[PDB]
Design an enzyme around this catalytic site. Structure first.
Site, mmCIF file in Angstrom:
data_model
loop_
_atom_site.group_PDB
_atom_site.id
_atom_site.type_symbol
_atom_site.label_atom_id
_atom_site.label_comp_id
_atom_site.label_asym_id
_atom_site.label_seq_id
_atom_site.Cartn_x
_atom_site.Cartn_y
_atom_site.Cartn_z
ATOM 1 N N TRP A 48 -9.067 6.386 -1.157
ATOM 2 C CA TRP A 48 -9.358 7.066 -2.409
ATOM 3 C C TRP A 48 -8.368 6.585 -3.463
ATOM 4 C CZ3 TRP A 48 -8.265 10.046 2.069
ATOM 5 C CH2 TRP A 48 -6.942 10.481 2.168
ATOM 6 N N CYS A 75 0.839 -1.196 0.000
ATOM 7 C CA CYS A 75 0.000 0.000 0.000
ATOM 8 C C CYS A 75 0.876 1.249 0.000
ATOM 9 C CB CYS A 75 -0.952 0.034 1.198
ATOM 10 S SG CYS A 75 -2.038 1.510 1.258
HETATM 11 C C1 HEM Z 1 -6.416 6.689 1.295
HETATM 12 C C2 HEM Z 1 -5.676 6.522 0.194
HETATM 13 C C3 HEM Z 1 -5.122 5.149 -0.272
HETATM 14 C C4 HEM Z 1 -4.399 5.009 -1.376
HETATM 15 C C5 HEM Z 1 -4.021 6.179 -2.310
HETATM 16 C C6 HEM Z 1 -4.049 3.609 -1.540
HETATM 17 C C7 HEM Z 1 -3.297 3.058 -2.560
HETATM 18 C C8 HEM Z 1 -3.013 1.725 -2.802
HETATM 19 C C9 HEM Z 1 -2.503 1.153 -4.039
HETATM 20 C C10 HEM Z 1 -2.208 1.995 -5.305
HETATM 21 C C11 HEM Z 1 -2.362 -0.182 -3.845
HETATM 22 C C12 HEM Z 1 -1.846 -1.271 -4.805
HETATM 23 C C13 HEM Z 1 -2.713 -1.406 -6.048
HETATM 24 C C14 HEM Z 1 -1.828 -1.737 -7.240
HETATM 25 O O1 HEM Z 1 -0.578 -1.564 -7.145
HETATM 26 O O2 HEM Z 1 -2.376 -2.172 -8.290
HETATM 27 C C15 HEM Z 1 -2.763 -0.483 -2.482
HETATM 28 C C16 HEM Z 1 -2.772 -1.712 -1.875
HETATM 29 C C17 HEM Z 1 -3.319 -1.979 -0.632
HETATM 30 N N1 HEM Z 1 -3.939 -1.077 0.204
HETATM 31 FE FE1 HEM Z 1 -3.938 0.968 0.014
HETATM 32 N N2 HEM Z 1 -4.582 2.933 -0.469
HETATM 33 C C18 HEM Z 1 -5.270 3.831 0.336
HETATM 34 C C19 HEM Z 1 -5.955 3.497 1.498
HETATM 35 C C20 HEM Z 1 -5.969 2.250 2.098
HETATM 36 C C21 HEM Z 1 -6.740 1.853 3.277
HETATM 37 C C22 HEM Z 1 -7.684 2.804 4.035
HETATM 38 C C23 HEM Z 1 -6.483 0.554 3.534
HETATM 39 C C24 HEM Z 1 -7.004 -0.353 4.677
HETATM 40 C C25 HEM Z 1 -7.466 0.122 5.838
HETATM 41 C C26 HEM Z 1 -5.521 0.087 2.545
HETATM 42 C C27 HEM Z 1 -5.004 -1.188 2.447
HETATM 43 C C28 HEM Z 1 -4.340 -1.733 1.360
HETATM 44 C C29 HEM Z 1 -3.923 -3.112 1.223
HETATM 45 C C30 HEM Z 1 -4.174 -4.209 2.266
HETATM 46 C C31 HEM Z 1 -3.318 -3.253 0.048
HETATM 47 C C32 HEM Z 1 -2.710 -4.546 -0.527
HETATM 48 C C33 HEM Z 1 -3.728 -5.197 -1.446
HETATM 49 C C34 HEM Z 1 -3.183 -6.533 -1.863
HETATM 50 O O3 HEM Z 1 -2.305 -7.097 -1.148
HETATM 51 O O4 HEM Z 1 -3.629 -7.047 -2.926
HETATM 52 N N3 HEM Z 1 -5.244 1.146 1.695
HETATM 53 N N4 HEM Z 1 -3.152 0.691 -1.890
HETATM 54 C C1 LIG Z 2 -7.675 0.516 -0.169
HETATM 55 C C2 LIG Z 2 -7.197 0.710 -1.579
HETATM 56 C C3 LIG Z 2 -7.121 1.978 -2.139
HETATM 57 C C4 LIG Z 2 -6.668 2.098 -3.447
HETATM 58 N N1 LIG Z 2 -6.593 3.350 -3.971
HETATM 59 N N2 LIG Z 2 -6.334 0.990 -4.162
HETATM 60 C C5 LIG Z 2 -6.415 -0.262 -3.616
HETATM 61 C C6 LIG Z 2 -6.082 -1.402 -4.341
HETATM 62 C C7 LIG Z 2 -6.122 -2.662 -3.756
HETATM 63 C C8 LIG Z 2 -5.877 -3.950 -4.465
HETATM 64 C C9 LIG Z 2 -6.237 -5.050 -3.714
HETATM 65 C C10 LIG Z 2 -6.170 -6.337 -4.208
HETATM 66 C C11 LIG Z 2 -5.773 -6.550 -5.511
HETATM 67 C C12 LIG Z 2 -5.446 -5.455 -6.325
HETATM 68 C C13 LIG Z 2 -5.534 -4.142 -5.807
HETATM 69 C C14 LIG Z 2 -5.030 -5.652 -7.751
HETATM 70 N N3 LIG Z 2 -4.084 -4.596 -8.172
HETATM 71 C C15 LIG Z 2 -4.412 -7.026 -8.044
HETATM 72 C C16 LIG Z 2 -3.549 -7.553 -6.900
HETATM 73 C C17 LIG Z 2 -4.316 -8.496 -5.992
HETATM 74 C C18 LIG Z 2 -5.743 -8.000 -5.942
HETATM 75 C C19 LIG Z 2 -6.591 -2.769 -2.451
HETATM 76 C C20 LIG Z 2 -6.942 -1.650 -1.721
HETATM 77 C C21 LIG Z 2 -6.842 -0.403 -2.312
#
Ligand code: HEM
Ligand SMILES: Cc1cc(N)nc2cc(-c3ccc4c(c3)[C@@H](N)CCCC4)ccc12
Ligand code: HEM
Ligand SMILES: Cc1cc(N)nc2cc(-c3ccc4c(c3)[C@@H](N)CCCC4)ccc12
Ligand SMILES: Cc1cc(N)nc2cc(-c3ccc4c(c3)[C@@H](N)CCCC4)ccc12
Ligand SMILES: Cc1cc(N)nc2cc(-c3ccc4c(c3)[C@@H](N)CCCC4)ccc12
Ligand SMILES: [Ca+2]
Ligand SMILES: [Cl-]
Ligand SMILES: [Cl-]
Ligand SMILES: [Gd]
Ligand SMILES: [Zn+2]
Ligand SMILES: [Zn+2]
Ligand SMILES: [Zn+2]
Lengths: 401, 401
Positions: free
Chosen positions: B277, B105
């Protein structure tokens, strides 16, 4: 046997070759260090046997007459003198496999076409210079580039080492100012301090080709001017931004790495310079746009009248693509071999499929195979990869000071 | 301790937090698998013991009367019942830590400003739907988005799980078209097939918002339609490419992930949807340009009158940059929160600096933190990173069907 998936297509393969991984990497079940650039005596016989076994398996000659026989001579060679010499064809095969085994190299679809110059009979720093200049002229080839490696004498005790002090054969000067900041390439500030320290008088420009610093065993380094017409360089122009050429940017034609240690069959060649051709993003994105390199990006965006006042205009992204377009355009107009990151990565996918049926897998370092612009737009992005160490291989080595 | 370098600046830290890594991942000294997408009373007690320790550390009461009292309480409850219950303060702290610990994240600089809704008294699927709608309403906040998580009852012995079948709370249907193509989002063909099987009358557009399939313990899943006025959407236009609005593209305001498991102190919450967001590249590069998603890149490049017959024109990179420009512009116009990959990675570096002073390190998955375009233009590119699994944590879990 690790399961590897391609998320773009759905195919699944299994990497059985990772089983043979010899030297261990930096990662543990506790923590992954995949992103680190530099990962943190009769043993010679074991690596000699294995390498010789590779060679004869690759010529469909496993367990034959000459296979047994060549096992004997090396056993006896090291018994007598504590080391061995490689047959000419073995040095060629070891060089090619070391390229094939390089996990960070996206150009390995070419691994079979490598020209191996044998400099094992070198003796002086003046000799090295002529070996290095035949390589540079053959590899350059008036712009139609050809992969080549030159293999200087291996290492032995009692004697010093052949070493090239420059990181590459062609490098640009790095001059500090009355304020620290650099005219020229900041990556090469250090070696420029040495070239001056050993006799070179610095130029004034941002694109002064450094002199080579060549080192025969025990005797200290010696400066060598490179011949101007030997160093083929490309002035950079843009196909439609007519002011770009006036920025005065150039880059050279031959990427020739001269600080890595070739390791074949337990032998270590500390001077074995190799060269291929550039991927265009290496020049446009890394060398010209990296903040610690030439750092031209803001200067190119001002000339394009982009909104440098807010990140959300994506001004950095726009100027970077144009810088890359100009690199591609300039090298093509100069008839110098270059390949874009889309063509390159597509050939690597083809390489992965070839290596799958030939050896059951391919060591690949995801973080270096994926290009540094437009990553997810290339087919390697969605391809899972396994990273491990096979042999023969290219390794990093300490600086010779 | 692993030494971690930022190559852009030359900084060097040592990630001492990686030694407390509460589980093990996929890598070994033999082979790195960092690029893979998907890598009991006494142990429940030891996980609970360590979380209670964490909580009393963050409120500066480690080793106090109330700290020891709480360890005694938990052990006695696992003895009497096989499990235990979190206090509200412990739940809020554990949900924030799970976000703080999520290695992929990039938005974790916000980890402390998280709204935690306690829905552990939830009774049925129908109540579940009400909690969800209020989550969506609070987090959307008419375009000024807020970070939120709603926590449903924990897994416990004797009863099935609450499960949200949908991967995100807002998704667009994906209908297998007649010939073989997919109309709408191809990542969602399966959930769409299920929704139809469970009685949903299917639309036939490209951006049809899916109903929720909500699973009460030991009940079949139940279909709930989202009120149209709960789902804030953004029509996509380009500031200077006026034919772009004619594509009909839209995206939704709220990314709310609904299929991951939240783990706190050995307890498991298989239903705990969380929302933030968007970062603009998730929409523009991944959601719209991925060839297995909406795959608009070639259609966009053709309309731009780029030369799509050779890749060295960088038409792919040009078209993708303009798609990202349109996303940022469209979301700003609609007054819906959005962040670009330059600002997001910049704040993540501040997060890394904040985290090094607090815990002595920060788990980060480099391949996921670096954006899918303009990777080396962002400062996270030249930052080395250490990946490892801390708890509390969000985890993947199998699909309930
Ligand atoms: C508020 C602004 C936030 C932004 C801009 C953001 C951004 C991102 C991005 C861009 C990714 C990876 C997606 C990708 O690379 O394709 C990600 C993954 C993740 N985000 Fe954040 N996020 C936010 C908030 C949160 C919140 C509130 C939570 C949980 C309380 C969270 C938990 C996670 C988790 C667990 C992952 C990993 C997903 C996975 O393992 O597949 N995020 N986030
Ligand atoms: C909270 C949040 C905010 C954001 N702004 N984005 C987010 C993107 C993912 C995300 C979670 C799982 C998977 C993906 C994205 C995919 N990228 C593929 C990887 C495994 C599945 C999860 C959480 C996100
Ligand atoms: C001919 C076309 C070639 C292309 C397009 C190419 C391209 C590349 C690129 C893009 C990198 C990564 C640099 C970075 O991401 O910072 C790389 C690394 C590397 N290349 Fe190639 N290369 C070519 C030929 C060769 C040859 C002929 C050899 C050796 C005989 C070789 C050996 C290596 C090695 C060992 C690395 C990794 C260096 C390291 O780990 O630090 N390459 N190459
Ligand atoms: C044969 C070859 C061809 C090419 N086309 N490119 C190449 C780039 C490198 C290379 C190796 C290591 C490092 C760099 C480049 C640096 N430029 C970036 C990280 C520092 C270490 C090495 C060989 C290359
Ligand atoms: C995580 C990562 C991935 C990648 N794909 N590439 C990377 C290249 C460097 C790097 C960039 C520039 C320089 C170096 C390393 C130094 N090794 C060489 C001297 C300064 C120039 C650092 C990190 C990298
Ligand atoms: C090596 C790698 C790095 C990264 N940074 N990201 C990656 C994302 C995917 C990926 C791409 C598409 C889909 C998925 C994963 C699946 N999670 C299902 C969602 C849509 C299809 C695959 C590999 C990735
Ligand atoms: Ca202006
Ligand atoms: Cl270079
Ligand atoms: Cl998404
Ligand atoms: Gd226009
Ligand atoms: Zn760089
Ligand atoms: Zn690893
Ligand atoms: Zn993608």
């Amino acid at each position: 046997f690790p399961r590897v998936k391609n998320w773009e297509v759905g195919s699944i393969t299994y990497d059985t070759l990772s089983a043979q991984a010899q030297q261990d990497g930096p990662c543990t079940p506790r923590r992954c260090l995949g992103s680190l650039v530099f990962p943190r005596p009769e043993q010679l016989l074991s690596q000699a046997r294995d390498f010789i076994n590779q060679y004869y398996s690759s010529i469909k000659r496993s367990g034959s007459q000459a296979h047994e026989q060549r096992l004997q001579e090396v056993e006896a060679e090291v018994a007598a003198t504590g080391t061995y010499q490689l047959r000419e064809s073995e040095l060629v095969f070891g060089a090619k496999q070391a390229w094939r085994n390089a996990p960070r190299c996206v150009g390995r679809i070419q691994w079979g076409k490598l020209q191996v110059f044998d400099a094992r009979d070198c003796r002086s720093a003046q000799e090295m210079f002529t070996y290095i200049c035949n390589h540079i002229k053959y590899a350059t080839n008036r712009g139609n580039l050809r992969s080549a490696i030159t293999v200087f004498p291996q290492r032995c005790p009692g004697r010093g080492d052949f070493r090239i002090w420059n990181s590459q054969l062609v490098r640009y000067a790095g001059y500090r100012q009355q304020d620290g900041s650099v005219r020229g390439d900041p990556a090469n500030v250090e070696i420029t301090e040495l070239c001056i320290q050993h006799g070179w008088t610095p130029g004034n420009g941002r694109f002064d080709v450094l002199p080579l610093l060549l080192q025969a065993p025990d005797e200290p380094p010696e400066l060598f001017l490179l011949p101007p017409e030997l160093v083929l360089e490309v002035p950079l122009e843009h196909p439609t931004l007519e002011w770009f050429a006036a920025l005065g940017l150039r880059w050279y034609a031959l990427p020739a790495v001269s600080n890595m240690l070739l390791e074949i069959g337990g032998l270590e060649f500390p001077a074995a310079p190799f060269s291929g051709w550039y991927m265009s993003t290496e020049i446009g994105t890394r060398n010209l746009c990296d903040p610690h390199r030439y750092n031209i990006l803001e200067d190119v965006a001002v000339c394009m009248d982009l909104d440098t006042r807010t990140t959300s205009s994506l001004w950095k992204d726009k100027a970077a693509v144009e810088i890359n377009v100009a690199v591609l355009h300039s090298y093509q107009l100069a008839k110098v071999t270059i390949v874009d990151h889309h063509a390159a990565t597509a050939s690597f996918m083809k390489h992965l499929e070839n290596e799958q049926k030939a050896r059951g897998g391919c060591p690949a370092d995801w973080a270096w195979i994926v290009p540094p612009i437009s990553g997810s737009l290339t087919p390697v992005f969605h391809q899972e990869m396994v990273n491990y160490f096979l042999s023969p291989a290219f390794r990093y080595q300490p600086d010779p000071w």
